[PDB]
Design a protein around this nucleic acid. Structure first.
Ligand SMILES: [Mg+2]
Lengths: 152, 226, 62, 215, 107, 112, 254, 126, 40
RNA sequence: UUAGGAAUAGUUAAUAAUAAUUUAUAAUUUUGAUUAGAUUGUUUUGUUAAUGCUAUUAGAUGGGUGUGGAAAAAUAAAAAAAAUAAUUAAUAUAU
């Protein structure tokens, strides 16, 4: 796959508009291709004539990520993120955005807060993780006493 | 596991989902594999209110005294056909009335084309048993343009509720082999004017305004009043 | 009114109006003469309606 | 008669060796000292001993234990030793017009190759599931329990935890000391006198297996 | 060859085995009969299997029928115990009549 | 086990007779095990218990296990009357669903 | 003692060769389900790279005693429909068994006849498939199929595949795992090479064109009107019941 | 204050079962022996039971306990009790099995003395 | 516990349960909303 | 552990032996066995100056179903049991 990746990146960088056909015929169905193949192919999809061909080729690349068990990398989703005003292809799920907004607003208001910037010893660290204590508390006794017949 | 919901997340037992994996959770029960199922209670129970006033006859009872008038026999056959059709259309009831047993045509469930769901089955082979309303159907599954490489068994092929549109160009005779319909990304070139994707990965359908109004009235945000 | 052993609709006369139903806690439901399972069902239905969940469940009697 | 299983041929090849202790030379000698076949009756008997219905399949020795393989290799070594002038003439670069001799040579080559393959199976994979044996026409009760039951779902096999463990006698087979020390002699007997027994890569593996299992 | 290995955990006999030494007491006639008659019964049973197949097949078939149809064939803690009348001794009076006593060895 | 207070005397083991379940099954008409020959014309009285009489038991009350040909008995059921409310569909709410179908029998008795 | 050598963990199990539910019968259409995708990838290999012993001039002549030992697991292609002797010819006419050669007959050479050859001893099958040329795939000049007359030309175009299997085995037996080498096809790159005259007629696109108009909007999403099975993201159902991941739900009704 | 081991055992019982021990377990109960058989006709051949016999392995009188301080603990550093032992060979009538008599110590705290008991083991010699 | 609302698909069957688990698309949508609010 | 103390055995080891057609001068026991009786055990209880005497209620369960990972399965006020049912408080049960 890394040998075909250089051929795909060369056909993308030369602007020949034929790297997608090479990826379909040679790398798609018969290789365990990772997500940077489509990171290379998105630039070739960007140079299409009409915007609908670009949109349908990006959506078909996402369906290819779904079918052949090759998940989309962060760089590919950020490449599709930058052209959302033109293509309007959604590249994040419905779950990650609802987590992201509620995390980002909370982290912004927590960084702007002056009261809750103090350290919390219950939250910040673990004090001790060894199975035995670090200093002698006096116990054990190792001797019997009054009324105890069983020793040891 | 192979595919967990939201990864490993166990603050509640509902956060894992109603099923922990698409694979069967025990090896000894292969029928517990996760698949799309069909509401067979409403579908397999046909309306018996069309057989009233109609004298049906048993198969074994071929004695002379139990025979009925031929007009009564004909209206019994019409009522039995209306009883078999009353809920929905089967695959084996649609393929019998088609040329070449409907080989090459596109069969689809009712909910397979609504919403952002797009899936059909191009029929390849059907083995009818003696009860011709049942059997075993095979076909190439097409989901959002992508197609299988081999024919798969059509699950719930005996439960009614199927539809097809007969096209003479798709009909394949018994001499030839039904070809697989092409994947729109792989085999044929991608054209936006011929097929356009309704849904894709990392896509979710926008909220309908009536569902928004209904949820805000149920939660109490909008002033619902009689 | 869903359960057989929670006859919720048998206590319509034990409340004045909507506000009397939604202001009574479990001690006031014990005062009015309601059994334990029925007043637990009434209080959980009121607390679910306050959280945004209306009482839309299937009657499991038959 | 022509045996239909490998086990009946193993019993016949054992009775041939045990019925003629000192007469094992005169029993299986069918050739002269120059390579010409003397008696064709012994040739027709020895050809139909190693029949195609017994030793024709690739897994024909799947139920052969460590003791029966010694009988097979002893029979092959005795046939090679008594008729050495026939074999060392005909097997290398000689074409013969007799239709019986080519059939006997093909059957002997097939029997020796499957016997060496079974020796390598028992040596290189001890107690493996592909090295397990079973009884011929052995009672596997899981199949008879599935047949005489009603399967509404055929994936649900009744008595699965007991039926998958139990068949008529089925053992994990590995080479012992008395088996390996005999097979290291018989494999060396299968070769010629001009061959080097040091570079044989199966007798050395049997000797190293003996030393490793004795240590 | 009289001292075992503390590092490898070998026995007294295995250290002498790895040194090529022989420590064996002078045996009596019964102790040599115990070690010499192990191969004789194996050659007898192999000769019976080769010479009488129609009887050995029936014997192995009835032995497999007795083994397979048994009640305690499931591998469990009860079937996996080394001493069943000693570990489960409360069953020997009122439930199990196979063993009449709970002590057979030094344990 | 259960905690039991130790006594220096003998222990009483009671085999005390309970209410027979076959008796209340024959009274409520929910036995489904009585093979009774000699079909008669005398009427049968059945005391209706709570959730003990349905169509399944009443079918065997009409046709008993002895191989009857016709329900030739008058069957008196004490307190077996039911009262049904009219059912209707809800247009409002999250969806369309039919409620209101319920039986007032066995819980709201006549003649308080 | 004999009881205390090892424990009872992992005992000896009955193999799949003696279980009828694990053994695929050749009279069934399930035999042609397992072996037909192995043929459509082998012809993709033989049309793009030289496979050494995939094409012969005749049937391989093993003796009758060595016939059962050496032949199962062996495959070769010959020119024309010539069947080996000592076999009974059974033509596959079942459309349930012939449906699995659909990708083989449409995207590659057209399947004319599928025959099962059963011998006198009933122990060595042969799956004979006769193709009619030419190939729909481009064939390399260095490939193995370039040395075949029925594959190179566009009776004379007929060539036959021969695959020998054992009759009642698990589907582990009828596998062709040594032919899954993925050799590339240089058909899109043959245009720009020095061997073609089209190398100066193509124009490179180094920059994307300036987009004045945005993409066409999708039509208005209409929600379904039938009763749905539930949330497929928690019923562990793949995005259409077909493929994908449950954690990445798409393509359903919402 | 230094709490004893019984406080730690009570803490373990509280953390396990939720409570330490239910009270009133003594009850001063008069356990009366009622005989049934004849005078010298008890149905046993060696031990004839005619009184209230106490039941208990380690909670009976006079009290015993294992004494871990002996020759074996002085010689061998053991990973657990009874791992290494030293004894004498008394029987070789079995093949590959030596009968080894070993000794251990049992402590009587009432009389304050340790006694040597003997256990026979079967060992293996190849 | 899986909630069975009154507006689910009814199973008109006298040999089992009277209501199935087949939802409405509005129920699917509001269940997705509650799923996201638990996912945070 | 037995106020009136003697024999025990589906038996011990070896084993190319799963599933023992063989070998042996076999194994337990007067340093107290097997059987019969009593019998869940347990520095948790009580008492005393007491290494003494005296008490105990954690449990398990080879023929009900070879299912199940595990038989523990014919009935237990929670151990909340796959959509936040409810999580303010006290009765939490009678009802
Ligand atoms: Mg012996």
């Amino acid at each position: 796959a890394d040998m075909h990746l250089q051929v795909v990146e060369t056909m993308v960088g030369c602007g020949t508009m034929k790297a997608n056909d090479y990826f379909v015929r040679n790398v798609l169905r018969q290789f365990s291709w990772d997500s940077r193949f489509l990171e290379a192919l998105y630039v070739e999809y960007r140079r299409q004539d009409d915007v609908d061909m670009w949109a349908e080729l990006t959506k078909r690349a996402l369906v290819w990520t779904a079918r052949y068990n090759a998940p989309a990398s962060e760089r590919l989703r950020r490449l599709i993120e930058d052209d959302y005003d033109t293509i309007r292809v959604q590249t994040r799920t419905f779950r990650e955005l609802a987590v992201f907004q509620f995390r980002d607003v909370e982290e912004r208001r927590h960084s702007r807060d002056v009261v809750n910037e103090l350290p919390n010893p219950w939250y910040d660290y673990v004090a001790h993780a060894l199975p035995f204590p670090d200093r002698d508390a006096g116990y054990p006794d190792e001797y019997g006493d009054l009324g105890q017949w069983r020793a040891p | 596991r192979a595919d967990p919901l939201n990864g490993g997340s166990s603050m509640t037992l509902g956060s894992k989902g109603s099923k922990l994996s698409p694979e069967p959770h025990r090896r000894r029960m292969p029928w517990t594999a996760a698949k799309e199922y069909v509401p067979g209670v409403v579908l397999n129970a046909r309306d018996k209110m069309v057989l009233d006033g109609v004298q049906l006859l048993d198969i074994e009872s071929i004695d002379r005294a139990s025979q009925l008038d031929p007009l009564e026999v004909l209206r019994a056959v019409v009522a039995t056909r209306e009883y078999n059709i009353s809920t929905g259309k089967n695959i084996f009831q649609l393929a019998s009335q088609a040329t070449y047993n409907g080989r090459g045509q596109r069969f689809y469930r009712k909910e397979w084309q609504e919403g952002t769901y797009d899936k059909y089955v191009t029929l390849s082979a059907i083995d009818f048993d003696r009860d011709g309303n049942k059997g075993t159907a095979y076909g190439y599954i097409t989901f959002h343009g992508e197609t299988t490489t081999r024919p798969v068994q059509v699950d719930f092929a005996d439960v009614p509720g199927w539809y097809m549109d007969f096209v003479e160009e798709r009909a394949v005779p018994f001499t030839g082999i039904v070809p697989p319909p092409p994947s729109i990304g792989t085999d044929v070139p991608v054209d936006p004017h011929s097929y356009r994707l309704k849904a894709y990965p990392y896509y979710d359908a926008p909220n309908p305004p009536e569902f928004v109004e209904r949820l805000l009235k149920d939660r109490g945000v909008l002033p619902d009043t009689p | 009114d869903i359960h057989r052993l929670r006859p919720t609709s048998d206590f319509k006369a034990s409340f004045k109006d909507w506000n009397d139903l939604f202001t009574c806690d479990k001690r006031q439901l014990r005062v009015r003469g309601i059994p334990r399972m029925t007043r637990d069902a009434i209080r959980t239905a009121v607390q679910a309606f306050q959280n945004g969940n209306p009482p839309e469940r299937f009657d499991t009697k038959e | 008669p022509s045996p239909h299983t490998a086990l009946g041929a193993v019993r016949i090849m054992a009775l041939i060796s045990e019925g003629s202790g000192s007469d094992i030379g005169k029993t299986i000698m069918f050739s002269d000292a120059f390579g010409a076949v003397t008696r064709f009756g012994i040739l027709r008997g020895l050809s139909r001993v190693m029949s195609v219905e017994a030793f024709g399949c690739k897994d024909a020795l799947e139920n052969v234990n460590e003791s029966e393989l010694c009988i097979i290799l002893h029979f092959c070594a005795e046939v090679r030793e008594q008729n050495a002038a026939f074999f060392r003439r005909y097997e290398a670069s000689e074409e013969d017009s007799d239709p019986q001799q080519v059939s006997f040579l093909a059957k002997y080559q097939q029997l020796s190759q499957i016997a060496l393959a079974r020796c390598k199976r028992l040596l290189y994979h001890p107690d493996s599931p592909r090295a397990q044996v079973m009884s011929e026409d052995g009672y596997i009760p899981l199949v008879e329990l599935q047949r005489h039951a009603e399967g509404t779902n055929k994936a649900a096999l009744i008595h699965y935890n007991l039926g998958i463990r139990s068949a008529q006698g089925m053992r994990r087979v590995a080479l012992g000391a008395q088996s390996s020390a005999r097979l290291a002699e018989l494999v060396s007997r299968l070769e010629e006198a001009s061959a080097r027994v040091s570079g044989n890569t199966l007798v050395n593996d049997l000797v190293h297996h003996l030393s490793h299992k004795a240590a | 060859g009289l001292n075992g290995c503390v590092e490898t955990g070998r026995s007294r006999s295995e250290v002498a085995r790895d040194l090529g030494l022989s420590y064996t007491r002078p045996l009596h006639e019964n102790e040599k009969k115990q070690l010499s008659h192990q191969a004789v019964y194996y050659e007898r049973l192999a000769k019976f299997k080769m010479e009488q197949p129609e009887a050995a097949r029936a014997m192995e078939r009835e032995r497999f029928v007795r083994k397979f149809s048994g009640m305690f064939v499931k591998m469990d803690i009860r079937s996996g115990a080394p001493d069943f009348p000693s570990t489960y001794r409360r069953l020997l009076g009122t439930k199990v009549v196979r063993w009449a006593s709970k002590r057979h060895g030094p344990n | 086990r259960m905690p039991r207070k130790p006594t220096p005397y003998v222990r009483k083991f009671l085999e005390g007779c309970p209410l027979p379940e076959t008796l209340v099954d024959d009274i409520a008409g929910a036995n489904l095990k009585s093979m009774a020959p000699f079909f008669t014309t005398a009427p049968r009285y059945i005391v209706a218990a709570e959730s003990r009489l349905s169509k399944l038991f009443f079918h065997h009350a009409l046709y008993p296990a002895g191989g009857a040909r016709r329900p030739c008995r008058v069957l008196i059921v004490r307190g077996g009357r039911s009262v049904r409310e009219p059912s209707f569909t809800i247009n409002t709410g999250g969806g369309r669903g039919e409620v209101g179908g319920g039986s007032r029998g066995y819980r709201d008795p006549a003649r308080r | 003692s004999r009881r205390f050598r090892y424990n009872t963990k992992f005992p000896a199990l009955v193999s799949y060769n003696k279980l009828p539910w694990e053994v695929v019968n050749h009279e069934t259409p399930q035999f042609h389900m397992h072996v037909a995708p192995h043929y459509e990838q082998l012809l993709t290999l033989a049309a793009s790279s030289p496979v050494p012993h995939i094409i012969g001039s005749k049937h391989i002549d093993v003796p009758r005693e060595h016939r059962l030992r050496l032949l199962p697991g062996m495959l070769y292609l010959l020119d024309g429909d010539t069947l080996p002797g000592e076999f009974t010819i059974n033509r596959v006419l079942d459309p349930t068994a012939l449906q699995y050669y659909g990708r083989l007959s449409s995207q590659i050479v057209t399947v004319e006849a599928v025959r099962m050859l059963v011998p006198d001893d009933l122990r060595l099958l042969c799956n004979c498939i006769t193709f009619k040329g030419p190939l729909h795939l481009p064939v390399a000049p260095y490939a193995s199929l370039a040395s075949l007359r029925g594959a190179s030309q566009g009776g004379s175009n007929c060539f036959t595949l021969y695959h020998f299997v054992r009759p009642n085995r698990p589907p582990k037996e009828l596998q062709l795992e040594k032919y899954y080498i993925h050799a590339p096809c240089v058909a899109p790159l043959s245009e720009f090479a020095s061997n073609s005259d089209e190398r100066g007629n193509w124009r490179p696109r180094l920059q994307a064109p300036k987009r004045t108009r945005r993409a066409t909007p999708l039509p208005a999403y209409r929600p379904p009107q039938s009763y749905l099975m539930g949330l497929a993201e928690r019923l562990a159902v793949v995005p259409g019941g077909c493929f994908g991941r449950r954690s990445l739900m798409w393509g359903h009704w919402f | 204050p230094w709490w004893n081991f019984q406080t730690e055992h009570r803490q373990r019982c509280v953390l396990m079962y939720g409570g330490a021990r239910t009270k009133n377990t003594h009850n001063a109960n008069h356990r009366v022996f009622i005989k049934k058989y004849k005078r010298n006709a008890f149905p046993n051949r060696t031990r004839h039971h005619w009184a209230v016999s106490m039941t208990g392995v380690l909670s009976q009188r006079p009290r015993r306990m294992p004494w871990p301080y002996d020759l074996t603990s002085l010689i061998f550093n053991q990973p657990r009790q009874g791992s290494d032992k030293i004894g004498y060979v008394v029987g070789t009538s079995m093949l590959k099995t030596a009968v080894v008599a070993t000794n251990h110590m049992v402590y009587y705290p009432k009389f304050n003395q340790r006694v040597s008991r003997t256990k026979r083991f079967f060992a293996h010699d190849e | 516990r899986q909630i069975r609302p009154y507006y689910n698909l009814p199973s008109k069957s006298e040999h089992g349960r009277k209501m199935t688990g087949f939802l409405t698309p509005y129920r699917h949508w509001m269940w997705k909303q509650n799923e996201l609010w638990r996912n945070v």
